[PDB]
Amino acid sequence: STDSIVKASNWRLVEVGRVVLIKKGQSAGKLAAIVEIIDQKKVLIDGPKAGVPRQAINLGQVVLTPLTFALPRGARTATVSKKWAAAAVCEKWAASSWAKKIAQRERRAALTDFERFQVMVLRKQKRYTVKKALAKA
Amino acid sequence: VEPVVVIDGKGHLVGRLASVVAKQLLNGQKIVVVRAEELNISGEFFRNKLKYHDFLRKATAFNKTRGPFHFRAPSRIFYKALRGMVSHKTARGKAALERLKVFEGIPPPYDKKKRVVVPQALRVLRLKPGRKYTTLGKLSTSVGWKYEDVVAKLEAKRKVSSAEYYAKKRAFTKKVASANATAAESDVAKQLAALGY
Amino acid sequence: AHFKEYQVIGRRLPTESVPEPKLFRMRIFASNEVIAKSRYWYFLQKLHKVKKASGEIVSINQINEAHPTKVKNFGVWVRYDSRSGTHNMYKEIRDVSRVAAVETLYQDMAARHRARFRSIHILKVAEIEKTADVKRQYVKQFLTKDLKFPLPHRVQKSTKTFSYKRPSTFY
Amino acid sequence: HGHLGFLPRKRAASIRARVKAFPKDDRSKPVALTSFLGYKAGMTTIVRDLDRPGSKFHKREVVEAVTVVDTPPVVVVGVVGYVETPR
Amino acid sequence: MKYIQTEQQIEVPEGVTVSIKSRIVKVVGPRGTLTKNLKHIDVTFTKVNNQLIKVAVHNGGRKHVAALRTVKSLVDNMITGVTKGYKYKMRYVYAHFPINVNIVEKDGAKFIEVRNFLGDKKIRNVPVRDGVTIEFSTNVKDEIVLSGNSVEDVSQNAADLQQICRVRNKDIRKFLDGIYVSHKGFITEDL
Amino acid sequence: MRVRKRQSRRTSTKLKEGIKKKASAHRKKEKKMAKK
RNA sequence: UUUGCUCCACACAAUAUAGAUGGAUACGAAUAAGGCGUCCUUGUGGCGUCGCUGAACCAUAGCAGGCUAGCAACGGUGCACUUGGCGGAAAGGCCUUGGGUGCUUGCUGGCGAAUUGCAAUGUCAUUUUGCGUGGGGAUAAAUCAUUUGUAUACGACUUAGA
RNA sequence: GCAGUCAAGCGUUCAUAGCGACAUUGCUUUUUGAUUGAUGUCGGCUCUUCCUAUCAUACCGAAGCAGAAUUCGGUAA
RNA sequence: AGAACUGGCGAUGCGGGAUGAACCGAACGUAGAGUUAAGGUGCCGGAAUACACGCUCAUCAGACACCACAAAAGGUGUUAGUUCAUCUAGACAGCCGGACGGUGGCCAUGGAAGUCGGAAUCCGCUAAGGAGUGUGUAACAACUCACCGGCCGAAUGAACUA
């Protein structure tokens, strides 16, 4: 009970192996791996699975994700692909609430007018059942 | 898109908020600003106080009741910054200014409405960390505003009531979340999730 | 602009009883070939009194970066003019290409010494092969094993005028 | 000329002058009126036997002008409550 | 040079516990508890063990790194005050009029009352800050001892006592009367 | 807290054009004295 | 002053609108930090989870939304009443009780729509002011003129008079 | 101010092609401490306001400032 | 200031420079559509609170006439450079040690021993130690720094330029 407590911050770190999401440009909405750190504001990323070309990019163009994997500094594209597949980064991404929220946004954008009608009908039915349950409990 | 937009003025930079509000009012949106005593100004308190004292010395020499009226309250300081950004001597400018209300604290009826923020005017998003800044309540009290304590006591009472309301809302939200978690396995749930809902 | 690197080879104007002039070559960083040729004539005259009419450009090629996606430490030797005399400067720039490093240098010169493109002359750009040969600490700092740093105080972009929640600057 | 704090030199809005500041309250004390109403009824002169140490007129008698204010007791006929507001 | 990261160490002895949350620092040792609100500084606190705490500044400038060492030294002072305390000894001297120093209780609070300074009829009152205790030295002439966990409180109390007895409109070469901080040490002085 | 008067940064046309003439004269004299 | 004045309901007029056209949808504080859930030895605690925009959430099918037959459930919601509180910052609103009365698109059926002619805001909101009905309610002052002088250029002020 | 004296530095790099910051003869001038006012078309009063480059009042700093009195300075209209 | 040339204005509206004799665009019939100049794009106010790399925090910044006057410099503000330097056969900063002998050198002084005064400032031993960098005594003494060593480990200092 005589242990000191210092609250820590779970900052995402700019580091080799960190997974980033590109938010502006040709490869917006695609994942890439930070391969090298050019300076405070530029990193060399590489996104071979999703098709992102190997490039120098400002950290303002990407958002750091909570994903990391072991990657040698300065690794070439095939090595990045090998480490990426081995670490199963696409599965880790698809298994998260962030990527699922993106997928839901895209699907809702893709819905047809008939399908929005169907969504309304199903929401009314589910609502009926849930209000009944809420009143019961 | 709301008929009335209520901005919680806490943690906003005075001029950027004033610019935003002026454009919205001229474009035809009703705006209520609350908690004007919690607005920020970038720069040191001594610097902003000096600027106010320069404003204070400006007055009509032969009749002071004609000169610039130096309003001390935070809501009025914000209103001055806004009127400077409206063309207030025209009928259009007067109609724009008729679409605005500014308050200290959050009085009724706005204390039970939704409050929004203006991100392009937020101090935490705009000012660089380490830059000194001034708070409008302290500036107003130093220059002669006399209701800082009354507003603070009323705001404490409002916060107590609001915390009780939020506790009840949190309980109801938990109950509804459970009622929806019991229905995640149904056919309608699967169909809705397939459609994205 | 967006810089390109041009090799420019010129010579004296051929005349009678005058064969084989001194083939002067240079590497010019410029947005296009017209600016590169003008800069070549200017530098040629500064090096030696050879007017544009007294010379002739026999070749100009664009030089692409050999390994454009390899991170390289560059040493850049330059000299620039001001109200005071010309000054010589050495700078270290960590980037993936010479044109990127040269653009960075031009922007840094404008920001620091108020100098411009017409005032800067790029004497040499060379990759520093060994880590130990670097001098500037703002470059040597990014060369440590297992470098990691956070990005505190993330400011998110807002598309709409009003937000319905207070923003968090977490990252 | 004149004291600029007593501007403007205009007629008082009423014949009864307003009390614009009452004594600061102290809740521990018993309930008391802060003020009273009377009618001015002339002046006169008194002889006061002064006890004021340090003065040249200590232990000596002086003549003072005084004002007499006719004060029959007042009748209490109402009460008003005040709430403090940001205004 | 705009360093990427700068760090300072804060050692924690075997008896004290440090709690840090949102830059509020509570230090609890054998002798009590101190609390410091450091939200006016921009630093990050971490710990690897119960004996060492790191304070770090990321991508800071000259003023930021200047504040970093200050934060470390303030937490060090809190640790020292909670483990060994502070004891400031002051001596008052006079030529003719003996300075009279007492602890009085006025309006339910502790005051150091100074009487007959240079023959003054004026009573001087120095409020005793909370957390610092005032004593009078045994077998020593004209010595007052201020002891506390907070070095800030003790040093400011001693400064207030020294300044309250300033000599006005005289020669400080000739008139040496006053209360002076004789010594500054800790409440434990084993060696 | 008696804040004193502050110098105006609003430039007058007369001063602006006078400064322009001063600069022209300065340059012409610089050329002449460099010749001499 | 020939039922004058005022508050309710329907019933038609006139009025003019700085500008309805699903919903202004309520913690506080911090941002070098937080929200939510769970647990304990109850705190500056342990673990889990969330953000990366409201792109949300709720509403949302029916002559601009008619008339009917059932099924399942006893939920959702409106209206006129009623119970018990709470809110004074500009409270003028929030929550709750009980019964009655409708609707229900949670599910299955049955009739109607056309001709506004291939579009025309195609009229559905709410301010005020009047007139008519039936449901109630309450029965004053001020000014001039006269008068006082604590007032006064005139006004104004201040007294008095069944 | 005059002539200088060297130069901190500078001058298209150039020490006496040439400049040049800051610092050092003589002046009404003789020593022992003797005798050796301008303004005429401006000026009065009253009286308002403003500046501070503060005479007094307030608070401070220094000085052989013992005390007393004073000197120099800082904030201050 | 005296000349000579060439422009602008005069007889001249229009866009811009908030405003305007000599500034920046552009010269003019009445209209429609498109594109632009100069100048701009937080709001006033049409148009990016665009994107990017740097710098700056002013106790009345700056947003310009500038290859102009206050302007020669001052600053323990901040950034980037040039040339000198010292450094793991140990740098900078700190603690602790040493800091010696003729000798209290020589002249005037009541006294003056490195330190009220005037002249070369010497010789030996030294890792190293001035016939002394300051405080300090009546003279001493004591401390001190010049310089060298131990301590731990890593780059540090000076002068200039912008």
From Swiss-Prot, chain A:
Gene3D superfamilies, per the entry: 2.30.30.30, 6.10.250.2270
Miscellaneous comment text of the record: Present with 45300 molecules/cell in log phase SD medium. There are 2 genes for eL14 in yeast.
Organism whose genome encodes this protein: Saccharomyces cerevisiae (strain ATCC 204508 / S288c)
Disulfide bonds: none
Record's protein name: Large ribosomal subunit protein eL14A
Keyword field: Acetylation, Cytoplasm, Ribonucleoprotein, Ribosomal protein
Entry GO CC: cytosol; cytosolic large ribosomal subunit; nucleolus
Family: Belongs to the eukaryotic ribosomal protein eL14 family.
Record gene name: RPL14A
Pfam family, one: KOW
InterPro entries per the UniProt record, alphabetical: KOW, Rib_uL2_dom2, Ribosomal_eL14, Ribosomal_eL14_dom, Translation_prot_SH3-like_sf
Broad class of where this protein is predominantly found: cytoplasm
Chain's role: Component of the ribosome, a large ribonucleoprotein complex responsible for the synthesis of proteins in the cell. The small ribosomal subunit (SSU) binds messenger RNAs (mRNAs) and translates the encoded message by selecting cognate aminoacyl-transfer RNA (tRNA) molecules. The large subunit (LSU) contains the ribosomal catalytic site termed the peptidyl transferase center (PTC), which catalyzes the formation of peptide bonds, thereby polymerizing the amino acids delivered by tRNAs into a polypeptide chain.
GO biological process: cytoplasmic translation; macroautophagy; maturation of LSU-rRNA; ribosomal large subunit assembly; ribosomal large subunit biogenesis
From Swiss-Prot, chain B:
Classification via Gene3D superfamilies: 1.20.5.4280, Ribosomal protein L13
Post-translational modification note: N-terminally acetylated by acetyltransferase NatA.
Superkingdom in the source lineage: Eukaryota
Molecular function terms, GO-annotated: mRNA binding; RNA binding; structural constituent of ribosome
Family: Belongs to the universal ribosomal protein uL13 family.
Further remark: Present with 43300 molecules/cell in log phase SD medium. There are 2 genes for uL13 in yeast.
Name the UniProt record assigns to this protein: Large ribosomal subunit protein uL13A
Native species: Saccharomyces cerevisiae (strain ATCC 204508 / S288c)
Gene: RPL16A
UniProtKB/Swiss-Prot annotation, chain D:
Signal peptide segment: none
Disruption outcome: A mutant confers resistance to trichodermin, a trichotecene toxin produced by plant-pathogenic fungi.
Cross-link (Glycyl lysine isopeptide (Lys-Gly) (interchain with G-Cter in ubiquitin)): K29
Localization (cell): Cytoplasm
Residues modified as Phosphoserine: S14
Subunit structure: Component of the large ribosomal subunit (LSU). Mature yeast ribosomes consist of a small (40S) and a large (60S) subunit. The 40S small subunit contains 1 molecule of ribosomal RNA (18S rRNA) and 33 different proteins (encoded by 57 genes). The large 60S subunit contains 3 rRNA molecules (25S, 5.8S and 5S rRNA) and 46 different proteins (encoded by 81 genes). uL3 forms together with ES39L one of the contact sites for the signal recognition particle that targets ribosomes to the endoplasmic reticulum membrane.
Family listed: Belongs to the universal ribosomal protein uL3 family.
Role summary: Component of the ribosome, a large ribonucleoprotein complex responsible for the synthesis of proteins in the cell. The small ribosomal subunit (SSU) binds messenger RNAs (mRNAs) and translates the encoded message by selecting cognate aminoacyl-transfer RNA (tRNA) molecules. The large subunit (LSU) contains the ribosomal catalytic site termed the peptidyl transferase center (PTC), which catalyzes the formation of peptide bonds, thereby polymerizing the amino acids delivered by tRNAs into a polypeptide chain.
Name of the protein in its database record: Large ribosomal subunit protein uL3
Curated annotation (Swiss-Prot), chain E:
Disulfide bonds: none
Any single Pfam family the record assigns to this protein: Ribosomal_L6
Database matches in PROSITE patterns: RIBOSOMAL_L6_2 (PS00700)
Record has Ribonucleoprotein as a keyword: yes
Record SUPFAM superfamilies: Ribosomal protein L6 (SSF56053)
Domain of life assignment: Eukaryota
Protein name: Large ribosomal subunit protein uL6A
